[PDB]
């Protein structure tokens, strides 16, 4: 969850 956000948001950029 912690990385899913930082990784899910930076990947959608």
From Swiss-Prot:
Phenylalanine amide, modified sites: 13
Site (described: Important for antibacterial activity, and hemolysis activity): 6
Job of this protein: Shows weak hemolytic activity and antibacterial activity against both Gram-positive and Gram-negative bacteria probably by forming pores in the cell membrane. IsCT adopts an amphipathic alpha-helical structure.
Name assigned to this protein: Cytotoxic linear peptide IsCT
Organism of provenance: Opisthacanthus madagascariensis (Scorpion)
